[PDB]
Design a binder for this molecule. Sequence first.
Ligand SMILES: [Mg+2]
Ligand SMILES: [Mg+2]
Ligand SMILES: [Mg+2]
Ligand SMILES: [Mg+2]
Ligand SMILES: [Mg+2]
Ligand SMILES: [Mg+2]
Ligand SMILES: [Mg+2]
Ligand SMILES: [Mg+2]
Ligand SMILES: [Mg+2]
Ligand SMILES: [Mg+2]
Ligand SMILES: [Mg+2]
Ligand SMILES: [Mg+2]
Ligand SMILES: [Mg+2]
Ligand SMILES: [Mg+2]
Ligand SMILES: [Mg+2]
Ligand SMILES: [Mg+2]
Ligand SMILES: [Mg+2]
Ligand SMILES: [Mg+2]
Ligand SMILES: [Mg+2]
Ligand SMILES: [Mg+2]
Ligand SMILES: [Mg+2]
Ligand SMILES: [Mg+2]
Ligand SMILES: [Mg+2]
Ligand SMILES: [Mg+2]
Ligand SMILES: [Mg+2]
Lengths: 116, 25, 66, 181, 83
Amino acid sequence: ARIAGVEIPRNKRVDVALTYIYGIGKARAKEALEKTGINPATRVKDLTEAEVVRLREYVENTWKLEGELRAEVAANIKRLMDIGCYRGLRHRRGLPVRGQRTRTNARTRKGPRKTV
Amino acid sequence: GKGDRRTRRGKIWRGTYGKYRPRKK
Amino acid sequence: MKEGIHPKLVPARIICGCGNVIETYSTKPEIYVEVCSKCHPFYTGQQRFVDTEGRVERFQRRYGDS
Amino acid sequence: PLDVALKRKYYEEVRPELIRRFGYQNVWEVPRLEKVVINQGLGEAKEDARILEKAAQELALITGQKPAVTRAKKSISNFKLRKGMPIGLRVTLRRDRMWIFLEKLLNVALPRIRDFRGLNPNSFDGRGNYNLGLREQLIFPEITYDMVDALRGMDIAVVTTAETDEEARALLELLGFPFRK
Amino acid sequence: PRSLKKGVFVDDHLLEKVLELNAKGEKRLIKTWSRRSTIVPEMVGHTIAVYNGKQHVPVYITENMVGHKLGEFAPTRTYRGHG
RNA sequence: GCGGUCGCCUCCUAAAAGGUAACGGAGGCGCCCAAAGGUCCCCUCAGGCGGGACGGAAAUCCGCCGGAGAGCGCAAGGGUA
RNA sequence: GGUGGGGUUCCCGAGCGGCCAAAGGGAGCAGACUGUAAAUCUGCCCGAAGGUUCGAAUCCUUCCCCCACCACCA
RNA sequence: CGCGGGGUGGAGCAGCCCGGUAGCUCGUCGGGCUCAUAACCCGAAGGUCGUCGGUUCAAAUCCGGCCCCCGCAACCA
RNA sequence: GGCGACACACGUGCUACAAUGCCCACUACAAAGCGAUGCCACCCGGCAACGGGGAGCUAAUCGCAAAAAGGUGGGCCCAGUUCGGAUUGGGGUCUGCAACCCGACCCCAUGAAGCCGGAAUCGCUAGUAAUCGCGGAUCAGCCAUGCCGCGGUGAAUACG
Ligand SMILES: [Mg+2]
Ligand SMILES: [Mg+2]
Ligand SMILES: [Mg+2]
Ligand SMILES: [Mg+2]
Ligand SMILES: [Mg+2]
Ligand SMILES: [Mg+2]
Ligand SMILES: [Mg+2]
Ligand SMILES: [Mg+2]
Ligand SMILES: [Mg+2]
Ligand SMILES: [Mg+2]
Ligand SMILES: [Mg+2]
Ligand SMILES: [Mg+2]
Ligand SMILES: [Mg+2]
Ligand SMILES: [Mg+2]
Ligand SMILES: [Mg+2]
Ligand SMILES: [Mg+2]
Ligand SMILES: [Mg+2]
Ligand SMILES: [Mg+2]
Ligand SMILES: [Mg+2]
Ligand SMILES: [Mg+2]
Ligand SMILES: [Mg+2]
Ligand SMILES: [Mg+2]
Ligand SMILES: [Mg+2]
Ligand SMILES: [Mg+2]
Ligand SMILES: [Mg+2]
């Protein structure tokens, strides 16, 4: 069923289906399972609607999540720019932020190639 | 895969150790 | 209202992270709800859970002594 | 269905606080809610009426009224649209059924919106009615998420007998509209 | 990310001159070659001329610059695009 | 001679009835509609401003102001809420 | 207006009363060969309504268009 | 002045009849083959349609003007 | 400070696009080299990087050490997915006078391109090719996926 933001997962498995939420997966998943004492091998398709609210409230209230996270990530990145720092104007230019090299494939950060 | 540091054989690739590849006997 | 081809709109029961919303009055009675706010989850009677304000703050603190 | 908690809450909470604040001389002069008009611009569906009729099925479910269909006033070429094609759905609702719908809208719908730090308070149109747009339709309780083919939003128009803006705000404030202050 | 968390390294060349600018009664432009160092809190509100290898760049200093090195605000290259 | 033109409609020329010429100024027709027809019952524009998800100068929605500048199948005129 | 031919899978094209996803050709796709381009080779894929029989792409009525032809014009 | 035709990527041409999604050859650009170039092969980019009005929902396309272009005409005197 | 730039183009490579596959547990079998200004067992704290404590070894003595694929068992069930790990946010460990430019590593979050690659083009005839790990050199640390070596499992096919 539903989780912070919405993000309805289904079938699969409770522990895997929690990955499908923004802010959560692997580690943060398998942890919230035992702390609400729920079997991760169980399919979310069927479980007690109790384990659903046990899970929801924990995960929602433990740590910040989809809407809130995404805006906070975007928030620091803004602050890295507009403060004028090098970390920042590599966010301005859509260029690689940490080291690496732009003389050859930057592509992920750089975008498709525009030949000349 | 040998490039995901978060797997057993991933960490073996860089030959480092950690949570996903602890040292024990 | 025109007779025929119109939804019933019968008194219902809505649930949530809180107790029941008695009012209801809608088609499809006995509905389940993700999170209702006005019982004060969700920013109303704001809990402001997992709040931070640590963006400047964190490097102001642990860096204070260290 | 003449009970409707919000309706009552208007008379035994809101009307009084209203007179106390603006000091109205007359019984009628204090702001009333008339007419919440809901509207979907659906022109995303032009030549397919099959997409439309599923969406009007949707509104009726949340409103309890079968909506109208609005039709192209003029032909405007740049995005398709010859004249008289179905554009979207529009349902007027009042008098109870506006109440029962606004009630659900405040307690259930808006809480279910991603983020939602509250309703922008500049949408008062200055003669004192308020307007708001919604992104998806499953924020209403009547929608099951397995019935959605595609997410289409709407326009909600709420009309007040409040002559001014500041008044109309008060009314909706006291009704429990979560403004962003 | 990255590190120290014991020692919090900053050059004592300027830290002297900055501390001395704290309680002086004066605030002026301090030229430094030290980009290796870390910035603030006793540094904030001060104008430092930082070397990029070519010259000293003026930088005004404010609180959200906190944990950052002094070279971050003095970029070494010159680009302006290609075409 | 060559070129243009040749019947029909609208406006001006046309001198406040009508009519009125030139190889005077400008435009249109040779169709169309089984609803774009008869009748009864309702309804009232364009435009401007404010508001409103995808909606942008204008898709649809709400508020107010708007006596007709909109519409009337097509040219213009007269007419017309 | 008249006569004679038609109408087939994307194009052409044969089309028979015992079923003919309906010859064949080329087009397209995928294989083989490849200096380029091909050529060669292998596989993949009934105008309309009605009506006569047990069976209709086949016979008839009708309707729609095409091609052809002859003739007329107050 | 007269009449007919035209003007569209860098070149040369379709598309305009019949309103709605601009095509072809060459050229250009990136790659391949070669020791290398050319030929050849695999990819790509590039035009608002002379210009200004008008018609329409929509104009390269239909209408008007102006502007250059090609052709024909200018006879009896 | 730069040699690390970045509209772009090319060579050599690594990791892949998954089910003869990925993940978790347990369990095996090598060789060559390296190290007492170092290799570090074992114990403790840490999710971990690592930090404490500390024993042996000038080393067929003691240490790097776990070899990995493989074996067993369990999970995933064809999904841009438990494939793949690029980017990016935050949090830390270490070397070093110092990691902004420009380090390596750990953890949490993030999860991109990519569904087997146009014209073309490379290697390999046997313990070879494929695939799997391990060691040295340089070196404070390391941008090593490179290089030089080591063994593990181990094909196909040569008409002519
Ligand atoms: Mg670089
Ligand atoms: Mg993985
Ligand atoms: Mg009002
Ligand atoms: Mg003549
Ligand atoms: Mg007269
Ligand atoms: Mg007169
Ligand atoms: Mg004429
Ligand atoms: Mg209007
Ligand atoms: Mg408006
Ligand atoms: Mg008029
Ligand atoms: Mg070839
Ligand atoms: Mg070339
Ligand atoms: Mg060449
Ligand atoms: Mg136009
Ligand atoms: Mg003569
Ligand atoms: Mg170099
Ligand atoms: Mg490499
Ligand atoms: Mg011995
Ligand atoms: Mg993709
Ligand atoms: Mg650096
Ligand atoms: Mg797949
Ligand atoms: Mg390849
Ligand atoms: Mg040989
Ligand atoms: Mg492999
Ligand atoms: Mg190695």
